[PDB]
Amino acid sequence: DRVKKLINSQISLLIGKGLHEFDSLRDPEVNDFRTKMRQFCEEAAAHRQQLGWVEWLQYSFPLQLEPSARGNRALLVNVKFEGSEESFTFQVSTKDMPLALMACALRKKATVFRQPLVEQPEEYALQVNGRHEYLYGNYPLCHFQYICSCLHSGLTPHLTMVHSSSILAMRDEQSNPASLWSLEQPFSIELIEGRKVNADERMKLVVQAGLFHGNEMLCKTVSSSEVNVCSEPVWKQRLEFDISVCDLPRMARLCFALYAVVDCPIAWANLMLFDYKDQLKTGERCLYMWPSVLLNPAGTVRGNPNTESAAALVIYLPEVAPHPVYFPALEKILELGRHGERGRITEEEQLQLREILERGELYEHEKDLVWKMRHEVQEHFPEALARLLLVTKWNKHEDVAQMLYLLCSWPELPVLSALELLDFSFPDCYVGSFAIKSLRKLTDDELFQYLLQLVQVLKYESYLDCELTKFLLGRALANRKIGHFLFWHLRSEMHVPSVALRFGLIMEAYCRGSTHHMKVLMKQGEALSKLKALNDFVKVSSQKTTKPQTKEMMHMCMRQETYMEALSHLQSPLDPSTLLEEVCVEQCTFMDSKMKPLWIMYSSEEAGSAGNVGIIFKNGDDLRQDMLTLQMIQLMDVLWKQEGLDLRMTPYGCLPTGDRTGLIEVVLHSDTIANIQLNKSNMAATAAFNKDALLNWLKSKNPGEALDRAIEEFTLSCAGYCVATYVLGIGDRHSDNIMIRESGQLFHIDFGHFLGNRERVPFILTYDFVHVIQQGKTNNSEKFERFRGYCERAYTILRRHGLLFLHLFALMRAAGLPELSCSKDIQYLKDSLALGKTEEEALKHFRVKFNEALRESWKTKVN
Ligand SMILES: COC(=O)c1cc(-c2cc(-c3ncc(CN4CCN(C(C)C)CC4)o3)c3c[nH]nc3c2)cnc1OC
């Protein structure tokens, strides 16, 4: 049909890769992935189009609740009915539930319209005016993020009564169209030749080859003979490994590194020994290599798509048997693993086992004790599953079958444990399957929190069709916000050759599951394409004329019909709940920094003040580290709020959308410390002493009794960011990358460097901020020590969730961020949270660092 052709061309444009390219590979693994995932996503779409109207509100507008509310006071609210020019303003309590507010709005309508209504409060939901956000369910108004926000900023919540028939019309309009174990001989390969090799002709070419199960060697590495450097080297030699063909585990990867010797790294390539249908690979393989920036076991197991320029290694996998050989089925593995001797051990060694399972590297004897006592690990210490998997000999089929037998009856583990099991340190497919099974209980809020890490984990997958891909696709099709962010994390990496195929395939599958969301995302892509062209113009014009001239030309370009159309009426890529309605051209500008980022403002008559939102478009810088830093700060905020600690943080949106391209959220009514300290004349903040500048500026935005609250917001947020930058090792902090809101809230921007990348970033206490905390007084120990108490409380809360931060950062090593690429980076976090200590030892150590920072601050106070 014409529609099928149209959807295919629309998916090709959205994902940034023509669907015909997938067909041209003539790859049965790619073909099977496309078929099975299309069917799976089409089933999810059919389940969706028939949801009840409240279930469809949960899909499209998942509730945004306060972290404390997950798992009294007078309040003024403005309520109108859909398509009404008339609204009603009434008093409710923060403890009241949406239904009581709805019943109240219905009584007011019945009185004003002089008729007894047919409608009951149960037939409606409350939309947040001009936003894709709703208040529904049995939660008090204060438990909703929107009301909580209105309450702290003093503003009046504006809501719209939306009838179930209107929600159903949305549902309807948004519808998709109508045996191995006998093979004892050592594993071996034939290294035939190399093609398109480039290196110094004075050198020799060597091929280092290794067998791996994740990062662990299955046997020692084997190297070729040294052959003269030339474009087409010829080895035609046998490389025999110290492992039997029967002992190769299911996820065994064969890793290669081509290099030059007088070391000079040239290229690397990896491949799985068994294909996607569990068959042991035989025959010739031409491996298109990746250039080395020597073995790379974590590297992708798919060849370099750039066959024209890539170095190629031709290898031969020998026919081990006259018939095809498959990895044994689970029932065959369970039969072998079912037999084994159960460990009977003394109370003295039982004390030692409990000591090492609760304790982290182990000694060789401590490993044998864990392995011998594996049944006791399962029955009494099930959370120690990861330790047991790390002592298992993955290069011995009987040990693997015994481990697999126990795993197949292992109790489901907490989400924290399951996160650890997704690391490349647990490469087995059954371990991966078990980790997903324990993650199915993740709430949509917890999943959204860890989505960025789960997407990075995809880069560790050995095959296209995997449990993690299906898990992420099913959760994305069941929650529109999850779907939104899954698409953007995949899309923003389509320029990376190693992931373009996998990521391209997942995005096609998602689009099959939601035709309407594909068109919504295409409209975002159209706006981003215009912003790129607009930004290129600005970068050029900025080197030739004055800012007033570049700014006027920018506005003229935005006022073109194609730009007004493409830049208006879209869901924000930073937050699909935020609607970017009318682009306010007069308010748009660009920033004076290197990449000249665009500052784009929007307004919405339907949303009132809440509709006044902006986005910063930046091109030329990689935004992945900023996003990760901000998500870690947002996680800290959630963890603190769960302990009743609100440090008034500003975790603003930051989202990579393409190659060195992305969006950053505009925080209105905010300015940098540097701009405020310029201490300009004929201003309400002009100071007698530059130290008075921040406090005068706060005084001008908060007259009378409001000043005390602004100083309190400043103190709380300063404690949060002092702790956050210390734990994350955020250095290069100055007056131009620290901002303050009119409310008093301090926040950081532009997170270029973290994890002390290499020197230990000390705790930072700046005098200018000590001056506001102390209310402009030289000595105010009462206020300064309340601030120290907020720092200590914030730090001790984070420490308790230390393992969560460690598991998440470990998953992030897959991202390929230069500041997060080894054990040394994770070690930094281990030191900053001082996790190898008691809470008393860590707090004493934190106080030493905090006191070391105040002495450093005093070298400015004495001046
Ligand atoms: C240097 O630029 C970047 O590369 C960058 C910027 C931000 C940022 C800045 C402001 C911000 N800078 C200065 C201001 C204050 N002025 C803004 C323009 N106003 C005019 C148009 C009236 C005057 C006040 O703000 C951010 C503000 N919200 N979010 C920001 C992110 C975040 N990450 C960044 O890189 C990752």
From Swiss-Prot:
Catalytic activity: a 1,2-diacyl-sn-glycero-3-phospho-(1D-myo-inositol-4,5-bisphosphate) + ATP = a 1,2-diacyl-sn-glycero-3-phospho-(1D-myo-inositol-3,4,5-trisphosphate) + ADP + H(+); a 1,2-diacyl-sn-glycero-3-phospho-(1D-myo-inositol) + ATP = a 1,2-diacyl-sn-glycero-3-phospho-(1D-myo-inositol-3-phosphate) + ADP + H(+); 1-octadecanoyl-2-(5Z,8Z,11Z,14Z)-eicosatetraenoyl-sn-glycero-3-phospho-1D-myo-inositol 4,5-bisphosphate + ATP = 1-octadecanoyl-2-(5Z,8Z,11Z,14Z-eicosatetraenoyl)-sn-glycero-3-phospho-(1D-myo-inositol 3,4,5-triphosphate) + ADP + H(+)
Mutant lacking the gene: phenotype: Null mutants are viable and fertile but display defective adaptive and innate immune responses due to signaling defects in multiple cell types including B-, T- and mast and natural killer cells.
Subcellular location: Cytoplasm
Keyword Transferase applies: yes
EC class (word): transferase
Family: Belongs to the PI3/PI4-kinase family.
Name of the protein in question: Phosphatidylinositol 4,5-bisphosphate 3-kinase catalytic subunit delta isoform
CDD domains in the record: C2_PI3K_class_I_beta_delta, PI3Kc_IA_delta
Physiological role: Phosphoinositide-3-kinase (PI3K) phosphorylates phosphatidylinositol (PI) and its phosphorylated derivatives at position 3 of the inositol ring to produce 3-phosphoinositides. Uses ATP and PtdIns(4,5)P2 (phosphatidylinositol 4,5-bisphosphate) to generate phosphatidylinositol 3,4,5-trisphosphate (PIP3). PIP3 plays a key role by recruiting PH domain-containing proteins to the membrane, including AKT1 and PDPK1, activating signaling cascades involved in cell growth, survival, proliferation, motility and morphology. Mediates immune responses.
Modified positions (Phosphotyrosine) in chain numbering: Y363
Native source organism of the sequence: Mus musculus (Mouse)
Region (G-loop): 590-596
Chief location category: cytoplasm
This protein's pathway: Phospholipid metabolism; phosphatidylinositol phosphate biosynthesis
Domain C2 PI3K-type as annotated: residue spans: 183-318
Biological process, per Gene Ontology: adaptive immune response; B cell activation; B cell homeostasis; cell differentiation; cell surface receptor signaling pathway; chemotaxis; defense response to fungus; homeostasis of number of cells
Any single Pfam family the record assigns to this protein: PI3Ka
Sequence segments annotated as region (Activation loop): 748-766
Quaternary structure and interacting proteins, as annotated: Heterodimer of a catalytic subunit PIK3CD and a p85 regulatory subunit (PIK3R1, PIK3R2 or PIK3R3). Interacts with ERAS and HRAS.
Known EC number: 2.7.1.137, 2.7.1.153
GO CC annotation terms, alphabetical: cytosol
Domain PI3K/PI4K catalytic: residue ranges: 584-858
